[model samples]
Target: MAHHHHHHMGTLEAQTQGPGSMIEQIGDSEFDNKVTSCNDNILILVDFWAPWCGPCRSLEPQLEKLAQQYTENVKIYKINIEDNQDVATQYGVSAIPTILMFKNGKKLSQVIGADISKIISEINNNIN
Candidate 1:
């Protein structure tokens, strides 16, 4: 018999969120391993940002929350464009806080800036 796992949502506070965050940081060094060789079923959300990007600072918390919210279905990675310029320029990401969505190792879509609702909508669209 298959063991059915029932996930219970029992907390209403931010305390319920994952500690230390599920979101991880990637760079030009691991971009291929993180995305190209990643699970096809996993939806990868790559955040291209610089540490000094004001909007990106505000956006990080939300992405972390969504990382916890989506769990295994979504994988969020932060790539510091300042530190990983090679990958940033390779992708032609000229703006900060650009959210790139990838699945099956291909760049399927993206949402620019810190629009949380639109980001959520894109994730929902792909995850579904």
Candidate 2:
């Protein structure tokens, strides 16, 4: 055992937040890894949302559309404020449905509501 190389951990594929889906539901504790700590060129958009917010629900359809459009290039993470407060307070998110965009670990743009047009416009400006 002293000189043996590290062996494979297991045969079953790990249950990571893998790339099968375009959307990822994350927590405040994951804020850094999912949003602020990304080291790739893929744009990361964090949606500060609540379960009871109607507008947030309305905005999700378009978010899903965009998620696929940029499937390999962008990652959309949904953070439920009711379940996670630290990130909400950290970002000063007093309202629901705040979309914060990031690239290379930087806060590039932020939309305060479920304004689809504005969100799209902002995403365009940053993505390309």
Candidate 3:
């Protein structure tokens, strides 16, 4: 089982609210593997979502739950893809809710769509 760590609820709760005031509004633009705040030691899960997608709304809670469940083992970054179109296009995102798992600067998997169960299972299988 993956080790878990709880995030400061204040931070995540703020993110769970939506795009206007995410925990890290600049996360997509600033976050990368080489930064002091991010690297191999962290399993990074980038959630690419848009405000208009209903599925994105539904998946937000699931992502939050998963983030809470595997807090220690992973660092989840929520990206409002609409606001960060450059990053989204670079990653070839064609859907509203796309999940990318990265480790040590490498992509472990990229899951698109809103099926929480399958997405969660994909995450478990991909993470080392």
TM agreement with the true structure for every prediction: 0.62, 0.64, 0.58
Put the candidates in TM-score order, highest first: 2, 1, 3
User: Which window of 10 residues has the lowest lDDT sum in candidate 2?
Assistant: 6-15
Segments in model 3 whose C-alpha atoms lie over 4 Å from true places: 1-24, 27-29, 33-38, 50-60, 80-87
Best by lDDT: 2
Candidate 1 lDDT, 1-128, residue by residue in tens: 66543222221222232324565677677877777777666888776543342342222445665766787788777664445456556667655546677888777667665556777777788886
- Provide the global lDDT of candidate 1 against the true structure: 0.61
Best by TM-score: 2
User: Candidate 3, TM-score vs. the true structure?
Assistant: 0.58
In model 1, state the lDDT of residue 103. 85
Cα lDDT for residue 117, model 1? 75
Residue 37 alpha-carbon offset, candidate 1, angstroms: 1.9
Q: Which stretches of candidate 1 lie over 4 Å from their true place?
A: 1-20, 50-60, 80-94
Model 3, residue pairs in steric clash: 5-72
Report the lDDT tens digits of candidate 2 across residue range 48-125: 543242342222335666777887888877664446456557877654456678899877777764556777788888
Worst 10 residues of 1 by lDDT: 6-15
Each model's lDDT comes to 0.61, 0.63, 0.55
**Backbone clashes under 3 angstroms, per model:** 0, 0, 1
